[PDB]
Design a protein around this ligand. Structure first.
Ligand SMILES: Nc1nc2c(ncn2[C@@H]2O[C@H](COP(=O)(O)OP(=O)(O)NP(=O)(O)O)[C@@H](O)[C@H]2O)c(=O)[nH]1
Ligand SMILES: [Ca+2]
Ligand SMILES: [Ca+2]
Ligand SMILES: [Mg+2]
Ligand SMILES: [Mg+2]
Length: 166
């Protein structure tokens, strides 16, 4: 069957692990344990296609983000995550988008922009601000909550549908 290699990137603490774990394991991780590099694999049906999702959960902390560059190389699509209550994480999306272009050596890489923690009310990144960034990249913007599951499946499945357009 088809295997989709997804890579989740973004600043420390934005919810990359919580998103992946909600998708794969159907529970919310409340605690904050910084990731080095973890992998998840699950067979799913997406739009009638039996798929294997291979998901790489990467480090957002600079301290633990050593061999990030090497493990991202095989990625077929990237979830670029920021948190809607963390303006700096939004501003830093460009650093990831540019690192992605490097490891893939292409200007046309399947990507989805994700604004996570949308259950929170201390919002400092407005939807329209993120829509504009996504539009500049020619990619979708989707908001998610790893806590409530809002948008979680839609974000990962949208990334698969972006990979299929390339
Ligand atoms: N309210 C709320 N909290 C969230 C959400 N997603 C993650 N969190 C919280 O934010 C903290 C960090 O989440 P985590 O998934 O570990 O972040 P990360 O991006 O993987 N961090 P790292 O890059 O260091 O591995 C945790 O306390 C987690 O419960 C969300 O959608 N809503
Ligand atoms: Ca593949
Ligand atoms: Ca812990
Ligand atoms: Mg993590
Ligand atoms: Mg503002």
């Amino acid at each position: 069957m088809t295997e989709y290699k997804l890579v989740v990137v973004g600043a420390g603490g934005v919810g990359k692990s919580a998103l992946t774990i909600q998708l794969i394991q159907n529970h919310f991780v409340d605690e904050y344990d910084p990731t080095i590099e973890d992998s998840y694999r699950k067979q799913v049906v997406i739009d009638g296609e039996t798929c294997l999702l291979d998901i790489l959960d990467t480090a957002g902390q600079e301290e633990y983000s050593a061999m990030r560059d090497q493990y991202m190389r095989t990625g077929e699509g990237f979830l670029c995550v920021f948190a809607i209550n963390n303006t700096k994480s939004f501003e830093d999306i460009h650093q990831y988008a540019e690192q992605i272009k490097r490891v893939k050596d292409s200007d046309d890489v399947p990507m989805v922009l994700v604004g996570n923690k949308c259950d929170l009310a201390a919002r400092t990144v407005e939807s329209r601000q993120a829509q504009d960034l996504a539009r500049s990249y020619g990619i979708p913007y989707i908001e998610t909550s790893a806590k409530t599951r809002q948008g979680v499946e839609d974000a990962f499945y949208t990334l698969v549908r972006e990979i299929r357009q390339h």
